A paper describes a structure:
In the nucleotide pool, which is more susceptible to oxidation by reactive oxygen species than DNA, human MutT homolog 1 (hMTH1, human NUDT1) is the most prominent mammalian enzyme among other enzymes responsible for sanitization of the nucleotide pool. hMTH1 is characterized by broad substrate specificity as compared with Escherichia coli MutT; that is, hMTH1 hydrolyzes different oxidized nucleotides such as 8-oxo-dGTP, 2-oxo-dATP, and 8-oxo-dATP with almost the same efficiency, whereas MutT shows high substrate specificity for 8-oxoguanine nucleotides. Here, we carried out structural and kinetic analyses of hMTH1 and demonstrated that hMTH1 shows broad substrate specificity for 8-oxo-dGTP and 2-oxo-dATP because of the exchange of the protonation state at Asp-119 and Asp-120 depending on the substrate.
Therefore, the 8-oxoG moiety shifts toward the solvent region in the D120A mutant compared with D120N. This result indicates lower occupancy and/or loose binding of 8-oxo-dGTP. The differences in the recognition of the 8-oxoG and deoxyribose moieties between the wild type and the mutants give rise to the difference in the position of the triphosphate moiety in 8-oxo-dGTP between the mutant structures and the original ones (active configuration bound to the Nudix motif) in the wild type structure. The structural arrangement of the triphosphate reflects the lower kcat values in both mutants.
Author numbering: 1 to 156
Write the structure that this text describes.
């Protein structure tokens, strides 16, 4: 069996648009994603998600709602990524670009799937329908899915 490391992913989903962030630097730059990163010792998963949202997008929110969980496995990496996915309840500030991340709004008929992680084409439609989900994706490198599962659930 494998070990897993905890990560968060936050989607700022409004009725007609979604905020995504483009990774600006380093390996893996050039794709759009939600905001997030590793959970730190002691903080709850939700508080880690709020923290990463503020660091990467500038937005400060009091509460999130958990919508999904996605496990990622990469060929050659024994550690799994256990990603807890949240959506914002409400926002009340503007997103800010950093040297690491550029936030941008997309209309919900212009979701930039071809420039997102390949897995997002599978679970993001569920998120848009306000459904909850569990997913698993095995990748060869950054682009190729070798195996995956996706299931709508009633409780995350
Ligand atoms: Na991050």
């Amino acid at each position: 069996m494998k070990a897993s490391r905890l990560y968060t992913l936050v989607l700022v989903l409004q009725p007609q648009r979604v905020l995504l962030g483009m990774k600006k630097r380093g390996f893996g730059a050039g794709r759009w994603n939600g905001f997030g990163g590793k959970v730190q010792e002691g903080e709850t998963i939700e508080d880690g998600a709020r923290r990463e949202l503020q660091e990467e997008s500038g937005l400060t929110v009091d509460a999130l709602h958990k919508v999904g969980q996605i496990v990622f496995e990469f060929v050659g990496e024994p550690e799994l990524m256990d990603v807890h996915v949240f959506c914002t309840d409400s926002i009340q500030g503007t997103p800010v670009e950093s040297d690491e991340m550029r936030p941008c709004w997309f209309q919900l008929d212009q979701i930039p799937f071809k420039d997102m992680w390949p897995d997002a084409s599978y679970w993001f439609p569920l998120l848009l329908q306000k459904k909850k989900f569990h997913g698993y994706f095995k990748f060869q490198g950054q682009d190729t899915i070798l195996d995956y599962t996706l299931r709508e659930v009633d409780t995350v």
